[PDB]
């Protein structure tokens, strides 16, 4: 009760500090009258921005490097597939469910289960299997081939959690299962780039897991937090440090709901990881 | 816990299971009287000593402080006796752990007795669904009030917690199981206190006001929920996981905790409490 409440106070204060002012120099602004942020108040830390036209950030919490982003707006699809291609994406985790995707009010393009042409990019996907994660939650696996004029064809593994519960929170147990599936798909594809001699492997802003739910601050932060607690080398980090690093690297809302922070506390607890600093 | 301790736990439990295996017309197990099918599955029998009625495959279980009734899903021909058990028991909560998909598969012969209104010999029942409660990971408990009316007898209302979308394929995590054990306890606690303010004589009877729990055979998911309910009680602290599964098996049959995945939920919950797995 006590330490959790204190953890919330420090994170609320940080959040308030990070709040976006009008045309805030810390946050990426829409250059050119195109809509950049899907939600007016979930903005992109400029400094860690991957591209000027996407609301997406490079995050690194300890040893864990990922890209967290919002679900791309229809107009952002070509830049979004360019980000996935240049990054040589070892795994793309989509945490928005099929019910969310299919509800047109939300305007979330089904870009990875269909084949399409986006400016100069042609993509096609193939479903290869479903993997159970626990409690009936299933990850549907797809191969996304991105082809571009004059450029190489890049294949991106997609882990889609098709039936992520729209109502309840996902347990820490299913979250750890999903973090582990995401690391193993990433490890495998990374070793394929390595055996083919891609320069990609030497460049630390490449081969990063790309993770997004709808806005890229709730579920996204739950999974990234779990992937960090999973890598041994992150031993020294408290929950206070991890959420803090995510917030100053994307925006103040990373780990948006209490239900998401409780999953991070449960996992921490199971490791003897500290919640707070001191 | 350690792979080693878990493996030893499985050895002790397998030996007990083999000690308890039913011989032909075994005196420890309830035998079908006449040409009436008693057992929904012929290998999953009913311990005679703790049996509730001679015509049901259902047992009184008491692990430490926790008293429940575990039964198989009643066969069509057992529905009147089943409703009599639920009424005489003054059942505070009936937890049904078989999903809607299982119930609707006619090959399985599982009568949908709690979501419909019907007449079974002299008993008339009716249900009303009152609300769904979310347990975690998209699993939902659908709540129903079952009213059992019988000629010359009182009308009794049984709260039903139905886990409508219990996953048919995977195991249910310890987190959702803990959420389900707690809903069941709270529903029971409430109906128990209504009988108490009304002055029910039943609250002093230790064979009454027991949670009735059943899945399909009443040995797998049933054993998972009952183990969790025992661990939610402070007076059961001294008991290892070996003692709880061993008592359940001697009180019903030795298939209680039917799968390894069921045992692993019990080990995860145990671990989170610093409860021991083994005895010594």
Curated annotation (Swiss-Prot), chain B:
Q: Which family does it belong to?
A: Belongs to the protein-tyrosine phosphatase family. Non-receptor class subfamily.
Q: Name the job this protein performs.
A: Essential virulence determinant. This protein is a protein tyrosine phosphatase. The essential function of YopH in Yersinia pathogenesis is host-protein dephosphorylation. It contributes to the ability of the bacteria to resist phagocytosis by peritoneal macrophages.
**What's this protein's name?**
Tyrosine-protein phosphatase YopH
Q: Name one GO molecular function term.
A: protein tyrosine phosphatase activity
> How does the record describe its quaternary structure?
Monomer.
Q: What is its main location?
A: secreted
Does the entry feature the keyword Secreted, yes or no? yes
* Portion of the full-length sequence here: 189 to 468 of 468
Q: List the GO cellular component terms.
A: extracellular region
